[PDB]
Amino acid sequence: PARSVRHIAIPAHRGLITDRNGEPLAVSTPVTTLWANPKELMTAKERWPQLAAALGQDTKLFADRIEQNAEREFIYLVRGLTPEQGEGVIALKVPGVYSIEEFRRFYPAGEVVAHAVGFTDVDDRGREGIELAFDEWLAGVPGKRQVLKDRRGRVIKDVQVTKNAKPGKTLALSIDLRLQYLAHRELRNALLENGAKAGSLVIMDVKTGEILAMTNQPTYNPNNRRNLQPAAMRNRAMIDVFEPGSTVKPFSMSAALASGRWKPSDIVDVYPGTLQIGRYTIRDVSRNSRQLDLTGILIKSSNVGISKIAFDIGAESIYSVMQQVGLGQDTGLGFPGERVGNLPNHRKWPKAETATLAYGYGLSVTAIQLAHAYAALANDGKSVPLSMTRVDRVPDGVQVISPEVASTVQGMLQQVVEAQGGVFRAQVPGYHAAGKSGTARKAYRSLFAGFAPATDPRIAMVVVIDEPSGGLVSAPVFSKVMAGALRLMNVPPDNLP
């Protein structure tokens, strides 16, 4: 053409991501991009070597690159320069070479909140985490303007803006960066001490459904992704599925106490630590007991004890509690490759399946699901939807366990942490803590799920440590992060004289 009127897209500024207190976690930064018009470049060959050497390119590869594209009006030269190397190259004044400021993401907290926030691709689109999950909200609407272009396809005139670029909107996460630092650090120190390869730690507000901290090791620096490894990029807390084992026994007990047939002081004979059912044998981790009360069944994590209770009340009651607290269910968070795990259902529950569900081998969950289930028990039996964004108006949420049963089970989990023979390494200096260890098979994962303070719960937490060198590995991690979380949140002690 003698001349052509053309569309040009005006990029939108991507919305700021903050923590719940407004601390920046992802910010769109002006970067210097140099681009070129080959058609203009072909008229200034004597400038190429100087241009090549400025971009640190082999003269010949650069010349071959221009010649092989002599028919196009655009090629990137280099993206993500400081203003200085922009002006260092524009200083040359090569025909067909231009500087533009593009927006690129910077992650001020880096590796500390990598998995939760995620990262954008080269086109400034979300690739992982919140960046992908809220991409529409954050992206805004690119703009449009009419330009006039010559034979060589260069902008000779700005005609009009036809649509204004709409800025992306700010997003406050539920994450408290201070709790997230404490969690990242304590988990890192736990893997080292315990000789473990990987791990996750989730902290939830039991009243609001807010995820206050979500940390995975190993982690990566999202500002430097050249030496990428899918191992480091793995959001384990939302992706890793495991059999929760003893950590779901409190939901089996919740069904027992709601049945009308069981109270805490009731007794089960678990001698001799094994129970044959058809061809299958249920086996306890410790086999030194006869009569146990329901609290003792939790303290000893007796698979025999919880099996005999499950046979008495039926698997249907247990399945229903686990379903209602979200185990094996969609979290509704919309994070990419979030797994739902599996809470298998039956019309007919034989003894074998009934027992395996009750002691937590008949299902697979994520750390986030387990944390959400502990939040509902901790919130006196009321489930609140999970949120990764700051909650200002709390949803109504659902009464899934009766407050009386939830209170009784809280008191049981407090005695699991506090009673002689209990998980004493979970005790939280300040406050009555409540929780339960488990081991999930792989080699295995050490689990601890709990909440505090035990009387007036505020925070639920799950700690997963994969293949240490079982559950008395995770207990101390919970102790440290919980004390630290309750203090950063100015929660007051409930263990006083």
Essential attributes:
3 domains, alpha+beta, 31% helix, Beta-Lactamase, Beta-lactamase, 21 strands, 5-stranded mixed beta sheet
The share of residues in helices is 25-40%
Rg, please?
A: 29 Å
Question: What is the number of strand segments?
Answer: 21
Number of spatially distinct domains: 3
CATH architecture of the largest domain: 3-Layer(aba) Sandwich
Largest sheet descriptor: 5 strands, mixed
CATH topology of the largest domain: Beta-lactamase
How much beta, percentage-wise? 15-25%
End-to-end span in angstroms?
A: 89 Å
How would you name the CATH homologous superfamily of the largest domain? DD-peptidase/beta-lactamase superfamily
Kindly summarize this structure in a few lines.
With 497 residues, the chain is α+β, with helices and mostly antiparallel strands. It has helices spanning 38-41, 48-54, 59-67, 83-90, 114-117, 129-133, 135-139, 177-194, 236-239, 249-258, 294-300, 303-313, 315-324, 351-358, 367-378, 403-418, 474-488; strands spanning 4-10, 17-18, 24-36, 75-81, 97-106, 119-120, 126-128, 143-149, 155-163, 171-172, 198-205, 211-217, 267-269, 274-277, 280-283, 291-293, 382-383, 398-399, 434-441, 444-452, 459-466. Pathway: Cell wall biogenesis; peptidoglycan biosynthesis.
